[PDB]
C-alpha cells in the first residue's frame, strides 16, 4: 500500500 505521514 501506499504511506503519507502528515507530521
Ligand atoms: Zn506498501
Same mark, same amino acid.
Given at each position: 500500500?501506499? !504511506?503519507? !505521514? !502528515?507530521?
Amino acid at each position: 500500500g501506499s !504511506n503519507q !505521514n !502528515n507530521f
